Write an enzyme that holds these catalytic residues in place. Structure first.
Site, PDB file in Angstrom:
ATOM      1  N   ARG A  53      48.185  -3.570 -25.928  1.00  0.00           N
ATOM      2  CA  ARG A  53      48.225  -4.686 -26.919  1.00  0.00           C
ATOM      3  C   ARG A  53      46.773  -5.183 -27.043  1.00  0.00           C
ATOM      4  O   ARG A  53      46.207  -5.683 -26.062  1.00  0.00           O
ATOM      5  CB  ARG A  53      49.099  -5.801 -26.351  1.00  0.00           C
ATOM      6  N   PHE A  58      40.157 -11.633 -29.617  1.00  0.00           N
ATOM      7  CA  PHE A  58      41.068 -12.397 -28.768  1.00  0.00           C
ATOM      8  C   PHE A  58      41.128 -11.769 -27.339  1.00  0.00           C
ATOM      9  O   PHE A  58      40.500 -12.338 -26.390  1.00  0.00           O
ATOM     10  CB  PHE A  58      42.444 -12.538 -29.442  1.00  0.00           C
TER      11      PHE A  58
END
Length: 162
Positions: A53, A58
């Site tokens: 992921r 981020f």
């Protein structure tokens, strides 16, 4: 404090090595877990697993070496383990922090931050930092998508401790 490493491969291609300092002085149970998962000294660990992921600007999340999707992984302790403390804060890129599914649910999943992520402070335990290879972390991040899906597979080709 332990120093550990991961050699990263992206699609077919070696990207380089990330070295990490683990903060056993602050969060000993957390640092020791991640250390053993790098060495496979307890019989299992991160080698050959993926960053499943990846969200640009981020974080890059991995450590799910059982289900490879965010649902699995396991700590060295035989069960999930508590949040040790939140002393270390998500102050910039290049930090190691534990993924979880709520208070006291640490297993083997973790993420490397790609920016300051201070909205996670007090929710995720930070336990280490990248000391060399920030640019390899950037190559990982380069495979990210807004929805987290990796554009090419990113694999921990090898890992260990110094």
């Amino acid at each position: 404090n332990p120093q550990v490493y991961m050699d990263i491969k992206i699609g077919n291609k070696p990207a380089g090595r990330i070295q990490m300092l683990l903060r056993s002085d602050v969060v000993p149970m957390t640092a020791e877990n991640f250390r053993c998962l790098c060495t496979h000294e307890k019989g299992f660990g991160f080698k050959g697993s993926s960053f499943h992921r990846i969200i640009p600007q981020f974080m890059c999340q991995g450590g799910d070496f059982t289900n490879h999707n965010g649902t699995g992984g396991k700590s060295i302790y035989g069960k999930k383990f508590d949040d040790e403390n939140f002393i270390l804060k998500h102050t910039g890129p290049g930090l190691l922090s534990m993924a979880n599914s709520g208070p006291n649910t640490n297993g083997s999943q973790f993420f490397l931050t790609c920016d300051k992520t201070d909205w996670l402070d007090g929710k995720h335990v930070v336990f280490g930092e990248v000391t060399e290879g920030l640019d390899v972390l950037r190559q990982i991040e380069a495979q990210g998508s807004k929805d987290g899906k990796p554009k090419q597979k990113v694999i921990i080709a090898d890992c260990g401790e110094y």
